[PDB]
Design an enzyme around this catalytic site. Structure first.
Site, PDB file in Angstrom:
ATOM      1  N   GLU A   1     -24.785 -11.691 -21.479  1.00 58.38           N
ATOM      2  CA  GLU A   1     -25.099 -12.826 -20.612  1.00 58.38           C
ATOM      3  C   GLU A   1     -25.247 -12.382 -19.164  1.00 58.38           C
ATOM      4  OE1 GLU A   1     -22.237 -15.955 -21.314  1.00 58.38           O
ATOM      5  OE2 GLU A   1     -21.954 -15.400 -23.416  1.00 58.38           O
TER       6      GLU A   1
ATOM      7  N   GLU B   1     -14.355 -15.342 -25.961  1.00 57.06           N
ATOM      8  CA  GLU B   1     -13.300 -15.464 -24.956  1.00 57.06           C
ATOM      9  C   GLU B   1     -11.875 -15.776 -25.410  1.00 57.06           C
ATOM     10  OE1 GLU B   1     -14.976 -18.342 -22.254  1.00 57.06           O
ATOM     11  OE2 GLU B   1     -16.822 -17.191 -22.022  1.00 57.06           O
TER      12      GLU B   1
END
Ligand SMILES: O[C@@H]1[C@@H](O)[C@H](O[C@@H]2CO[C@@H](O)[C@H](O)[C@H]2O)OC[C@H]1O
Ligand SMILES: O[C@@H]1[C@@H](O)[C@H](O)OC[C@H]1O
Ligand code: NA
Length: 330
Positions: A240, A133
């Protein structure tokens, strides 16, 4: 379950099927994992704070248990995650006086952590989410602010990938992120990875977190992102995956159970998603869900603390949901 199809077998010629776990859920959902997945990711125990809580103090116990479980069942393991703005202890960025360390000192600490962690699992873990991220999720800036970036500079990602490659040159190294299919962010992620690969940096894949909702991102956006990232020549992992019953604007906390409409739309949504993944089987090599059954999901407390979500293919009793049938029948 006796006559139930096995997820990993159904998709044997398309991609691995994985699940995020922790020592507790391995015990609680052991049979589901054994019957359906061929890949495992540590939900939290391979993150910085859970591996090196204090400088020089490594706590590999929980991660070791997860790896032992995976290896005893011939399941692959994705390492998650080395450098991230979250779940990283304050000691990492401070000196004795409590002030921020220098670029060189932080790089030394980054290299030490990466080297120690990656070398321990070399030969058992085939890929690592090296950078997690780093791209901004809002604004016009390319990168999100973080202590890593502030202290080292914008080349901190180049260094992380090089350190990881040196630690295990046979591992596949990934840049992992969420909201990866929204056009604006997709272009930032694309630009970032292209820039790194154009410099010869050892980034082998892009991890699409896929923390999705019933409506977002659209199928066209998912297709566009897959094609955009694939055009870079990298491998793609859906890392995910979960399909929340609540849109971002929906912060209700009183729903005790999903409506029949939610369940039905989720089934359709999962079928559409897997149909698209199968279509792109040549570039997608693994699809990992952030859990496996509704009795355990981080979405129960995120983004709204204290509620309940039903994001996966199996329910709280470990029974297949309508979404299961549509997913395996593509
Ligand atoms: O238990 C929670 C974890 O499930 C959670 O995992 C993160 C979910 O968001 C993704 O963007 C991250 O990569 C992934 O690590 O982290 C917080 C923890 O409390
Ligand atoms: O905290 C993060 C959240 O803001 C994002 O929406 O999904 C990924 C999480 O890690
Ligand atoms: Na594939």
């Amino acid at each position: 379950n006796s006559s139930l199809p096995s997820l990993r077998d159904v998709f044997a010629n398309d991609f691995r099927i994985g699940a995020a776990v922790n020592p507790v859920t391995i015990e609680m959902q052991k049979q589901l994992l054994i019957d359906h997945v061929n890949s495992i990711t540590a939900e939290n125990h391979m993150k910085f704070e859970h591996l090196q809580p204090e400088e020089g103090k490594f706590t590999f116990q929980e991660a070791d248990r997860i790896v032992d479980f995976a290896c005893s069942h011939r399941m692959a393991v994705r390492g998650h995650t080395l450098v991230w703005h979250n779940q990283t202890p304050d000691w990492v960025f401070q000196d004795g006086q409590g002030h921020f360390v220098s670029r060189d000192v932080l790089l030394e600490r980054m290299k030490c952590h990466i080297s120690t962690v990656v070398r321990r699992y070399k030969g058992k873990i085939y890929c690592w989410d090296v950078i997690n991220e780093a791209v901004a999720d809002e604004g016009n800036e390319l990168l999100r602010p973080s202590k890593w970036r502030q202290i080292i500079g914008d080349d901190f990602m180049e260094q992380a990938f090089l350190y990881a490659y040196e630690a295990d040159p046979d591992a596949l190294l990934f840049y992992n992120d969420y909201n990866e299919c929204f056009p604006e962010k997709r272009e930032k992620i694309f630009a970032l990875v292209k820039s790194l690969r154009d410099k010869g940096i050892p980034i082998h894949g892009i991890g699409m977190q896929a923390h999705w909702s019933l409506t977002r991102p659209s199928l066209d956006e998912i297709r566009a992102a897959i094609e955009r990232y694939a055009s870079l020549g990298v491998v793609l992992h859906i890392t995910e995956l979960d399909v929340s019953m609540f849109e971002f604007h929906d912060r209700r906390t009183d729903l005790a159970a999903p409506t029949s409409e939610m369940i039905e739309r989720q089934a359709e949504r999962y079928g559409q998603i897997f149909a698209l993944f199968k279509e792109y089987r040549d570039v997608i090599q693994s699809v990992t869900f952030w859990g496996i059954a509704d009795d355990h999901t981080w979405l129960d407390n995120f983004p709204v603390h204290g509620r309940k979500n039903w994001p996966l293919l199996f329910d709280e009793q470990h029974k297949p949901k309508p979404a299961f049938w549509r997913a395996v029948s593509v």
